[PDB]
Amino acid sequence: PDEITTAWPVNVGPLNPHLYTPNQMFAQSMVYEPLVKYQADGSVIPWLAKSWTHSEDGKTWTFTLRDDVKFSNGEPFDAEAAAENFRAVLDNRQRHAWLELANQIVDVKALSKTELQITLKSAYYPFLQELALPRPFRFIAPSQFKNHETMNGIKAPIGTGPWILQESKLNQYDVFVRNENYWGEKPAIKKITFNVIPDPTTRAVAFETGDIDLLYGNEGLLPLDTFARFSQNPAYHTQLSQPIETVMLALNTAKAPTNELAVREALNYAVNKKSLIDNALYGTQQVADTLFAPSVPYANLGLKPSQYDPQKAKALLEKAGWTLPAGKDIREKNGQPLRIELSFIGTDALSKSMAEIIQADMRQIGADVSLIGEEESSIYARQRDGRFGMIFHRTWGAPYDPHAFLSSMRVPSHADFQAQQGLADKPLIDKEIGEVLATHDETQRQALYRDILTRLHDEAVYLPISYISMMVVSKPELGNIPYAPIATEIPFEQIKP
Ligand SMILES: O=C(O)CN(CCN(CC(=O)O)Cc1ccccc1O)Cc1ccccc1
Ligand SMILES: [Cl-]
Ligand SMILES: [Fe+2]
Fold this sequence. Notes:
The PDB classes it as transport protein. By secondary structure, this protein is of the alpha+beta class. It has 2 domains: 1-241 and 470-497, Periplasmic binding protein-like II (D-Maltodextrin-Binding Protein, domain 2, 3-Layer(aba) Sandwich), CATH 3.40.190.10; 242-469, Dipeptide-binding Protein, Domain 3 (Dipeptide-binding Protein, domain 3). 28% of the residues lie in helices and 23% in strands. The protein has helices at residues 25-31, 79-90, 101-104, 127-131, 200-208, 224-230, 261-270, 273-280, 310-319, 349-363, 376-385, 403-408, 415-420, 426-437, 442-458; strands spanning 3-8, 36-38, 44-46, 49-54, 60-65, 105-110, 115-120, 145-146, 149-154, 163-169, 173-178, 191-196, 214-217, 237-240, 245-251, 286-287, 332-333, 336-337, 339-345, 368-374, 390-394, 462-468, 471-474. The strands form 7 sheets. A 6-stranded mixed β-sheet has the order 16-22-15-21-19-20. Strands 1-12-11-10 form a 4-stranded mixed β-sheet, with no helix packed on it. A hairpin with a 2-residue loop joins strand 8 (145-146) and strand 9. Helix 7 (261-270) packs antiparallel against helix 9 and helix 14 (426-437) packs antiparallel against helix 15. The longest helix is centred in the last third of the chain and has 17 residues, at 442-458. The protein binds the ligand O=C(O)CN(CCN(CC(=O)O)Cc1ccccc1O)Cc1ccccc1, chloride ion and fe (ii) ion. Chloride ion binds at residues 228, 231.
């Protein structure tokens, strides 16, 4: 009644606050809390820190912490505990290279039980927003460190947050209960069970049978034809949010033939995205023209969409010397076919479905796209080392878009650096991305984001496909289901059956 059952494709993991997969970002956020909390307006509010000041140069920050917070095991949260957590995360600094605050923090010390001082290398504007992310800058009770560190594992996953992990059964379920000694508001729901159900169809069946009360997730949550049917079923409740992030292809500028601007521009006119969404996504998502939607901060730039126009795609290819051999449908230039490999996760039906549309659309303009559907690990290896022609990719949602997504483009083991590696202006873009993050001058900040996103758009590095939404299917008795400000969090504490 005040207990709900839901599902997730895998277990939540050990819930080490400072590490990554197999820990799940939404479950880390249930147990662990940040110094400051992200809000839908892009600001942060006081959270475990009640207030803060910064030096004139923007480099030294002092937070005054709450004094009434306890970890769920009764141990105090105080500045020493916070400082030991920062030391634990930065004792594994290289693992957090993707997040620029991990390279910016020069020192963290507790000045007293309530005063915590953080010194940075530069006036890093996204500081507070970085501290608000699900990981790694949360807080586990230091008693639960293993040999005074977390990077080699933790003991019990003891946080300060509104949920406590009750128990986990690998490949079966995870059970959380509400923290009866939480410092903030008590959740209405007392117990949440997560059934581990990896397949989307099996998740929809589990809901139809009543085995689960709630499904919450992105466009991969359940089959979208089924979701549309459920939205008309008066026994159920469904929701579809406003878009949270972009799904796009990344095109390899460093690999023939996507190394040619004219080829990438042509590809960007070849796909009818509205058709793709109505055909493969059941009409449930929005067309994307631009790496970031115009509603994203700093990204309303009047960039010019490449609308579906196969006549233009062909013209661009022909002018570039890619013409059709007698009796053949695939173009050739300097003897070579216009062949491009598109890699995706082979077991993800929706990805496959999507890939097949893209392949068909680009044969219509004389490009031979070859589908390479592989297991997850192999696709992640291809992202990291640039072994792809085109690969599916997506942005990260608030509060990561755009600043953290752009920051990451500089990390060589990420798909975006690899896709961009062939650009003459790659070093200028990376220099500009470092500059934009440390700008105090609001005018210069906007000008640097315009230049970076305009170069990425004009160089046709991406093929934006969709802005996708978060979707919910629920038993009606749970009521309206809220969304969280951070796109990877699930706001269970806000559900009030
Ligand atoms: O991982 C995070 O905390 C955030 N992630 C930080 C980078 N990741 C570091 C890693 O996972 O090792 C590696 C990473 C790189 C490229 C795409 C996805 C990734 O998870 C990005 C993210 C944001 C929102 C939703 C999903 C992923
Ligand atoms: Cl619908
Ligand atoms: Fe990640």
